[PDB]
Amino acid sequence: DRPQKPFDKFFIDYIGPLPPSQGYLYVLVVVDGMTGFTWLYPTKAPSTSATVKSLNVLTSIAIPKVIHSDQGAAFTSSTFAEWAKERGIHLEFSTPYHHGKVERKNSDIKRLLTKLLVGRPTKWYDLLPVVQLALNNTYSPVLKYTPHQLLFGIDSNTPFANQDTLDLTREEELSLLQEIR
Amino acid sequence: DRPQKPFDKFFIDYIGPLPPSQGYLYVLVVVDGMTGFTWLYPTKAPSTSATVKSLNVLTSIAIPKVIHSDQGAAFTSSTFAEWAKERGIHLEFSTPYHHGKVERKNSDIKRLLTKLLVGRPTKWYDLLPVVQLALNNTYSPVLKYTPHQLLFGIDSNTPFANQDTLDLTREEELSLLQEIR
Amino acid sequence: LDAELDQLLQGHYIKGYPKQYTYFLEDGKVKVSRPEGVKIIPPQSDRQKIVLQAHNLAHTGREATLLKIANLYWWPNMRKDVVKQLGRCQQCLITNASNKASGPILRPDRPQKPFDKFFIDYIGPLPPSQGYLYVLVVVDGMTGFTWLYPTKAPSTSATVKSLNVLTSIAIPKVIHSDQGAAFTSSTFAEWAKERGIHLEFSTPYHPQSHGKVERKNSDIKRLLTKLLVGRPTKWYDLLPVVQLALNNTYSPVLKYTPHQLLFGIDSNTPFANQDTLDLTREEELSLLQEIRTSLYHPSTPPASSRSWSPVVGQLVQERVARPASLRPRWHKPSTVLKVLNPRTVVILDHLGNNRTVSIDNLKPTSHQ
Amino acid sequence: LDAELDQLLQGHYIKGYPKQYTYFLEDGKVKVSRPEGVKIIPPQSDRQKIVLQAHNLAHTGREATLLKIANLYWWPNMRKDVVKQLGRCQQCLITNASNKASGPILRPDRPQKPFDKFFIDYIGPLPPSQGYLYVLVVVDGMTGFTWLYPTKAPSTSATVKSLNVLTSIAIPKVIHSDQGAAFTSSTFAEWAKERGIHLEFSTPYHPQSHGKVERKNSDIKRLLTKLLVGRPTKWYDLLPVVQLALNNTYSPVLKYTPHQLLFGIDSNTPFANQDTLDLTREEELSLLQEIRTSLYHPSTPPASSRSWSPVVGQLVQERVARPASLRPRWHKPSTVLKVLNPRTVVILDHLGNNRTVSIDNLKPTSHQ
DNA sequence: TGCGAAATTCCATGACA
DNA sequence: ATTGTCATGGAATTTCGCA
DNA sequence: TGCGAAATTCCATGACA
DNA sequence: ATTGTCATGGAATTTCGCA
Ligand SMILES: C[C@@H]1CCO[C@H]2Cn3cc(C(=O)NCc4ccc(F)cc4F)c(=O)c(O)c3C(=O)N12
Ligand SMILES: C[C@@H]1CCO[C@H]2Cn3cc(C(=O)NCc4ccc(F)cc4F)c(=O)c(O)c3C(=O)N12
Ligand SMILES: [Mg+2]
Ligand SMILES: [Mg+2]
Ligand SMILES: [Mg+2]
Ligand SMILES: [Mg+2]
Ligand SMILES: [N+]
Ligand SMILES: [N+]
Ligand SMILES: [Zn+2]
Ligand SMILES: [Zn+2]
Predict the structure, then answer these.
(1) Binding positions for Mg(2+) 3 (chains C, D)?
(2) Of the residues A8, B22, B129, D66, which has the maximum number of CB atoms within 10 A of its CB?
(3) Which CATH code fits D98-105+304-365?
């Protein structure tokens, strides 16, 4: 059986609703399986349309052999099925309601997002670029390499050499418990 | 003493008033002495200004060493004197009131003009080009050559091989004696 | 078809498939172990579609197309199938650039006499000067002697007005020009018939064909520019000066000014040449005739290493004249009916009209 | 003066005036019987004025000027006096064309890594498509991998918007461009400082300097043209397709697609290359590093027979960028302060500002 | 029958929408 | 069923002045 | 150890405002 | 105080298939 490769499998999911930012509410999350390289796309809704629109951008850079997702409506619609078939992409769903490199990455994203939207729940749209750079230049303990390094075969010009706290501070836990009020 | 040449001497004179044609009344006559080549210019008046204006056209093709004229006002004005001095042209006047190649040419012009302005005393402006071609491709009995041939050293593409009547017919003498009525 | 590829699997020999290679079935497909790896041999009936798919990704040429196909496939003589499709892709044909140069320029004989041939053309539009915007330029073929007429438009009428004044002097056998609206109108045609003047037209969009006047245009603008340095561009009053100045300037290669070639003696202009002072006019015109016939004539240059010359029956394509944004620069293929000279041809255009056309506005259609 | 010319008449020898020739007074002027005829030797104090008069008739160069003078005059070393005036005629200097070619092009090293250097530029304006008129083109220096962004204007803002989306992927060391208003604004400068990005600018009006992107512009337009044949020019929806199609096309000389140079493995696009199926990613990235460093690099071509290369302290002239009708194509002479490389120089312009300038926008001032 | 320097000729370069 | 041209200024080559 | 033909590489040409 | 580039398709050159 052949070794795992970038473009072999893309893992997609939605995160949100979030607080409105430039009129956007969700984030389509794409993680390459082999490299853990992440791509993020702001959307107005978790719909087939917003998904197709966002993936068209990504799939004009690189096309995955397989897309993996949960059984979200957006992803199980017959529109989205057609879209994938047109591009020779195989669709793959995890069973309803039911650990790995990908799974950990999605955790980081949720956590990293939550950290930066404190005091500024509205400015997340502008931070998406840096969120991704951070995520993609984050050292992986399993492999000795960042997603950048594995995707491009080189060091990057933005090494995030500070392995950041990623934890909520005392002022921010009190800020998050006051944000919901 | 050196042989005579084209551009050696230009002979100028006015003919008119004529009947108005495109608003023009006179004709400035220029004949090169050596070749008998003729140039004609329609003017509105026999003035220094109309002369300068017309000769500027000609003198942007070829400049005479000497201009010869009678003592017309146009030609003896100090404006016209200045104009000539600027171009290194020497001015030359025949004595007041007082035979040759030039003299015969001026005769032809008056005669040829008179012939063609019968029945059309108003259309002379448009005929000036052809008047000149005729005059300049007219065989000279003294030299064996036309003015064209002597100026350019070649046959022309408009030989007027018909040595034309130049005389007034019976219908035209009766037309000229009825034109003055 | 499965016909050919069947014999292959049971180890028999087919022309074009080398025998020293192991051909086998797998996944429902004939395959082969070639040095670079294992490739699928598709059935002959599938090949055209494959070549096409590969080509259509980015409408790529021979190599870039083959490199895609070779990734998954092998069959005999692949490039032949590639070239076959390249030759049938209308889109590529009308859009791609040529990579063959035109054959070397002709240097046609100088007209033998003054007034044999005039070249005419317009310069402009120029900054308004006294309401005038254009200049009519008239160059005598043999002498280079030039006449300049300021106009308001590049119209037939202004053309006729200026030439009436010029042809007062002499009438030319031929007037040569480009296909500007001024020169191709019927009013202008009649004006020339009326005077026994033959209109000659350059092949379309090829100003080299009347290079004499185009070239005089450069000198006219260059002297106007110098004279106008640090002043406003009032050029109208300078035309006369420019005409006289240029007509009396030496061409270093010829050793004569155009005035001299026309008249055989300088007029009263500065630094007039005096060499013929002691000759008679007739001895002067005799020296002039000799001088006129022995003028330097340039030779046709060497061909560039990759030039093409037209052949009767060749598919060739005419350059689109004024192509819109994002539209092909070439017309559809057309056939060479006649080779007038090695730089000029008559083509049948597919409408089909006969067109006479410069080789410089042509490319030979690729892939036969 | 009459000093020199006096000794001459009474038969004594002066340097430069050959002794075997008869010099005599006549009409109040020193003369001489030379093979071509009798010429006036003017006094040294008159000569400059004469050379000038002759030159000014039509602002002619060396020979055409001399041929006028030689008609009436002779003195020793005439062309030296001619050349002296040619070198001082501001009008000729700023108007005449050059006849020396630029020295041969540099082929600078390919950037070593992806993201080391981006080249960017705008195409447009194009036929309106969905309200969009321009395309931002971004070419990775090392890989050739290109990104395309439709815009409404070639503004700094639309530039920033597009690049924010791109630099989500990776941040480049350098961004190289022409001096378009988009790239030279301070808003754009701050945007780059903010991210540790160094802005590099091509010397003005020299698109060769960022030839990589200019050249990708051609392919972008060429594929857009083919795709749009026989349809209306709705290009906006095609940008994505063009990007993907071009990033996955082979360069026949390199034997790789830019996608391959960037990622070292094809994604799920037609005719994906399978050669590295049995390698690990790490063995793949190892082969990629080797492949990247051994890519074909073109050599600097031979000089043309009449080229010039800049020297420090040379008088040179910069090409006027957008010259008005009937105005000189060259600025006044300026001095080369520094030769950065044989194709690039810093000049002091006579204002005088320091300017860094391509040799292609320069001519060496004639006549020293 | 040969030298140094001047004169002349060669000719690549660019430019006429 | 028509067609490149020529000023320009360094460099190459020739001619001149003298012996 | 050399042939004919196919494959690959060379590279002038033109074009990106 | 910076710098041309590369798809293209015939032709030239090399390699392949076979003996
Ligand atoms: C509307 C008419 C009808 C048809 O063509 C157009 C466009 N045109 C274009 C050029 C031109 O491109 N000149 C530059 C040039 C290029 C190459 C060369 F070898 C010599 C050169 F002078 C003209 O000179 C010109 O007169 C016209 C013109 O009159 N028209
Ligand atoms: C207003 C900005 C600021 C300054 O310059 C202008 C004009 N410009 C001109 C060209 C151009 O002439 N391209 C043709 C080309 C010519 C030669 C070559 F080797 C490569 C080539 F692509 C451009 O490409 C371009 O981008 C611009 C541009 O942006 N601007
Ligand atoms: Mg024209
Ligand atoms: Mg023209
Ligand atoms: Mg630009
Ligand atoms: Mg550009
Ligand atoms: N000819
Ligand atoms: N370099
Ligand atoms: Zn195609
Ligand atoms: Zn000058």
Answers:
(1) 116, 178
(2) D66
(3) 2.30.30.140
